[PDB]
Amino acid sequence: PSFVNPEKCDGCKALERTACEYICPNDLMTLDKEKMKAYNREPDMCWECYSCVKMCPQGAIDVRGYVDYSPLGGACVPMRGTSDIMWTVKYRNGKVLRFKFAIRTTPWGSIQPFEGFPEPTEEALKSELLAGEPEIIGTSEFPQVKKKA
């Protein structure tokens, strides 16, 4: 499960919103108003999805494998950018692996949902065609499927 490093967490007090609290799909990350530092409120409900880890601007969050089957010592640390993500995998025995993968080929927030699409019409609303079809499918005509005689 995820855990927060007290030394690196600043409670996102210099930001408009708390990144980890905002991103967690299972509502586990929350702030301890006392310390003004985050923590995982229910670790056994953590999916270890690393969303909080990737979005923490201070890199204060890491993941410690579930105790049920994880010997101590291992770690996977991501450094997510805009077009790619870097990973460092550290083995219990000290071995260190480094990887880098692409994550997006276009600028963030650049999607134009219906770019090139014609306007919808009442007539089209009655057909089987979805927005952009049939051309977005790659064919000039809507794909046909043989019904059993």
Partner: protein, 642 residues
């Protein structure tokens, strides 16, 4: 187990209600939900319709694709953009055979003819797809393509947000029940929910509601019961909410007995799709025996399913189950031999495929890479153990559990239209209520691309439904008030009885969410073909499960919650309990074992194509508190032969 730092208690009467009026309400901002929001926004313009998306978490990373995905499991390729083109008829045949003969082909062919467009849009939006030097999409197996999908969900979330508008997206709002037309017992009118960030009760009034909450997990006790109870293979975030609210409203469920048992890397549950299909990895028992071969004979009895290629997943599972029953574990995925064979002595090639192997994990299930690191497992040197996880209920993946939904006018046969009052694509048996992704049953193998696509289909149909029928349901204010009281009842119960004990979690008058969940998991694990009995059950066990679930359902009226987080956990439990009941009743009704490998009815061990080649559909009548079942015979809709 949950131990809140401090209390966050509210009484229903002190919580403000926020009423939201909209035309189309989409419950769940996951892959299918985002697909619906995206497509609804396009057609909504025809009537100046309002589209609203409600998500319990944050759309940017919510649902099954939170970590990203390593491949898009459904891409037909009708023009040759990938390494392998396929036909729609071949795809439909493939899905029906994998379902051991039972699939709504009108629904399968429908999403399949649309899915490729969705995939093409995904790439256009920025999703990096693996490509060969020639520029063709890299195939994993026959139907999937590899992707650099760490940001798969964020990209799709952005598209949905640009389409519908941020002011139409409600996050951190948990929907726990639907609302029906006051003047029509079989028409939806909206839904109710509550914020998990502040004291606010939500009442959504809508003309059409689309269920896109994902499937259900944690119904069954997992193979890890401590912290790792959180390592469910499927999305731990999905708790059968759609199943619950829809079944309570009277929407019919189908194939709810069809759970999915995933065979994955043990404990971490890392993916095996790439290892099997791409890296050509072999699975062997503790004695080096490749059971897909040594257990081939056991599949001959299944005709023609056992001779299909690929072998249906439940049958592949059955082969490993036989090994497990014989006690031939550990079962190994021989990654070391797969990499050595693929590299062929080329060290540079080895480094490349080695990196591809790790990306397959780091882009989708980091826990497996972490497990390897903690256990000092180097895939090029030693094999990894694999195992089937506990059961999960969903309709988008290899399982087809979900609501019985209407198909397109041009493909759906009369045999399948009888139960729908209104014939709109993906609409349930409740007028105005649609179901998509995991929530739509009888049309599996949708996965990410297919789920987003099914959402697009229901969305367009919802707009058509609204403009054609001009629905105008009225919510019942009395019911809303009763539901508002029920919403916060757990907190009020905690305050009322906490003084009976010096310990908050040891009280004789209430159970906390984690306590009721532990109980549910044990019941299902021991009586509903869970891991405890190697997925076997019978009439007596299932009947006992119903008796125990009855006790639990009654005790849900005594649930307590200490904060908003736990209040959500309380309703997530309620949702799972009813989902579990429906699952048990469905397994009890079908007197055959059609999916050995997923579950075995020891009292009806054979597959029965003479009387059970039908979809099992049920309806729960809340007013009478009665379940009714009926058999809908399968009919082949698309042209294909074995």
């Amino acid at each position: 187990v949950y131990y809140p730092k401090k209390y966050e208690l509210y009484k229903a009467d002190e919580v403000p209600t926020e009423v939201v009026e909209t035309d189309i309400l989409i419950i769940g901002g996951g892959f299918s939900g985002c697909g619906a929001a995206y497509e609804a926004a396009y057609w909504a313009k025809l009537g100046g319709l309002k589209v609203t998306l409600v998500e319990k978490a944050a759309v940017e990373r919510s649902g099954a694709v939170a970590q990203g995905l390593s491949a898009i499991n459904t891409y037909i390729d009708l023009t040759g953009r990938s390494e392998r083109q396929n036909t729609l008829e071949d795809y439909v045949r493939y899905v029906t055979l994998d379902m051991m003969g039972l699939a709504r082909e009108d629904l399968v062919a429908d999403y399949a003819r649309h899915v490729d467009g969705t995939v093409h849009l995904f790439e256009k939006w920025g999703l990096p797809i693996w490509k060969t030097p020639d520029g063709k999409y890299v195939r994993e197996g026959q139907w999937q393509i590899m992707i650099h999908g760490e940001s798969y969900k964020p990209i799709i979330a952005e598209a949905a947000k640009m389409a519908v508008g941020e002011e139409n997206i409600y996050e951190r709002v948990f929907i726990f029940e639907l609302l029906k037309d006051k003047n029509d017992p079989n028409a939806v009118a909206g839904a109710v929910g509550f914020s998990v960030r502040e004291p606010k009760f939500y009442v959504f009034k809508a003309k059409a509601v689309i269920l896109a909450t994902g499937g259900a997990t944690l119904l069954f006790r997992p193979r890890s019961t401590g912290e790792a109870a959180g390592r469910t293979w499927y999305a731990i975030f999905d708790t059968g909410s759609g199943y619950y609210m829809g079944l309570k409203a009277g929407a019919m469920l189908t194939q709810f007995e069809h759970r999915f048992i995933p065979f994955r890397f043990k404990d971490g549950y890392g993916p095996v799709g790439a290892w099997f299909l791409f890296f050509k990895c072999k699975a062997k028992n503790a004695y080096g025996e490749e059971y897909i071969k040594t257990r081939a004979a056991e599949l001959e009895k299944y005709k023609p399913y056992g001779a299909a290629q690929p072998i249906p997943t439940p049958l592949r599972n059955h082969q490993v189950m036989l090994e497990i029953m014989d006690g031939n574990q550990p079962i190994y995925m021989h990654t070391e031999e797969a990499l050595a064979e693929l590299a062929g002595g080329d060290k540079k090639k080895l480094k490349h495929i080695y990196e591809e192997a790790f990306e397959d994990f780091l882009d989708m299930t980091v826990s497996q890479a972490l497990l390897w690191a903690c256990q000092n497992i180097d895939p090029q040197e030693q094999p990894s153990e694999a195992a089937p996880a506990e059961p999960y209920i969903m309709g988008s993946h290899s399982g087809e559990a979900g609501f019985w939904v209407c198909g397109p006018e041009d493909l759906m046969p009369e045999e399948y239209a009888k139960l729908f009052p209104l014939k709109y694509n993906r609409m349930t048996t409740v007028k105005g209520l649609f179901a998509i992704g995991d929530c739509a049953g009888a049309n599996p193998h949708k996965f990410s691309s297919g789920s987003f696509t099914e959402g697009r289909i229901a969305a367009k149909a919802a707009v058509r439904f609204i403009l054609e029928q001009k629905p105008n349901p009225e919510i019942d204010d009395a019911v809303v008030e009763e539901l508002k009281k029920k919403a916060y009842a757990p907190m009020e119960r905690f305050m009322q009885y906490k003084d009976l004990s010096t310990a908050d979690d040891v009280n004789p008058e209430y159970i906390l969410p984690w306590q009721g969940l532990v109980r549910l998991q044990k019941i299902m694990d021991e009586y509903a073909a869970g891991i405890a009995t190697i997925y076997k059950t019978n009439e007596k066990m299932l009947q006992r499960a119903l008796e125990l679930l009855a006790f639990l359902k009654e005790d849900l009226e005594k649930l307590a919650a200490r904060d908003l987080h736990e209040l959500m956990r309380a309703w997530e439990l309620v949702h799972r309990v009813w989902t579990a009941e429906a699952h048990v009743r469905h397994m009890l009704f079908r007197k055959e074992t059609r999916w050995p490998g997923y579950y075995y009815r020891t009292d009806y061990p054979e597959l029965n194509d003479e009387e059970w080649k039908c979809f099992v559909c049920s309806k729960y009548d809340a007013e009478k508190d009665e379940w009714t079942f009926e058999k809908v015979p399968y009919v082949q809709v698309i042209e294909w032969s074995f």
